[PDB]
Design a protein around this ligand. Structure first.
Ligand code: Q9G
Length: 260
């Protein structure tokens, strides 16, 4: 379950984002005898019904099940008071996509692989627990000042495995397809998968065996892993545990990254 936070322990600073669901703010959380931390705060949109509130505190419930360094950390919720809130750890560099696009070219290959290794590690934990994300993309990964990447966001054609589009068959294996797309996003500093191709173009390309090329200057071993993730038969794709082990190995033997 999710912890109740006394609203007096919370100080809101600024609105950092908006959406149909409401607003996300940044602020500070100070519990007595504990160090103050920065936090992000998600609030339910004005005039919400009881149904909507329940659907909101349901997302906190789910998040509350996860305790892993690469999954966004739930501080708690406010429910004694109005409006309801969900409080998470503050992630200084925000969303991964936006982040890479503002820093195009600035990191090393090894740093990028580190980010991908963290994301892979969070997805292994998620799928270990029989949870399917369904919406895995760089926009739904958050990034802290130490470049630690954490899975967030508890449909998008370009990111979705063929069997999930065709049969609405969503599993950890279609999450692995999506992870492959994330690797490509990362190594490209946030380029749009499939560029100006339309959704229909993408669907038919995939079906005919088209797969995205290496991003510019991307190691061959990394692109080969993307290709593994995009195997047509879902059973042919690597498991997240194998993805993480492969990335540890590339990291452990940095010469394997030389070939581009
Ligand atoms: C507030 C919130 C609730 C649920 C959830 F899954 C994630 C969050 C959350 N936590 C955050 N920490 N640091 C951020 N920059 C940040 C953001 C969000 C959501 C919108 C994007 C920004």
């Amino acid at each position: 379950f999710a912890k109740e936070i006394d609203a007096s322990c919370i100080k809101i600073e600024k609105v950092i984002g908006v959406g149909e669901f409401g607003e996300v703010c940044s602020g500070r959380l100070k519990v007595p005898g504990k160090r103050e931390i920065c936090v992000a705060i998600k609030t339910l949109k004005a005039g919400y019904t009881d149904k909507q509130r329940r659907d909101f505190l349901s997302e906190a419930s789910i998040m509350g099940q996860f305790d892993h360094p690469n999954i966004i950390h739930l501080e708690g919720v406010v429910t004694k008071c109005k409006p309801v809130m969900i409080i998470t750890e503050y992630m200084e560099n925000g969303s991964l996509d936006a982040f890479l696009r503002k820093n195009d070219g600035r990191f090393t290959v090894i740093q990028l692989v580190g980010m991908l290794r963290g994301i892979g590690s969070g997805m292994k934990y998620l799928s270990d627990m029989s949870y399917v994300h369904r919406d895995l993309a760089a926009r739904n990964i958050l990034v802290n000042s130490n470049l630690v990447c954490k899975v967030s966001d508890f449909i998008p054609i370009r990111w979705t495995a063929p069997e999930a589009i065709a049969y609405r068959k969503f599993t950890s294996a279609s999450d692995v397809w999506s992870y492959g797309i994330v690797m490509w996003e990362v190594m490209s500093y946030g380029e749009r998968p499939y560029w100006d191709m339309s959704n229909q173009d993408v669907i038919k390309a995939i079906e005919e065996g088209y797969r995205l090329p290496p991003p510019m200057d991307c190691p061959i071993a990394l692109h080969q892993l993307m290709l593994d993730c995009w195997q047509k038969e879902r059973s042919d794709r690597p498991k997240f545990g194998q993805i993480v082990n492969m990335l540890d190995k590339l990291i452990r033997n940095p010469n394997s990254l030389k070939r581009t």
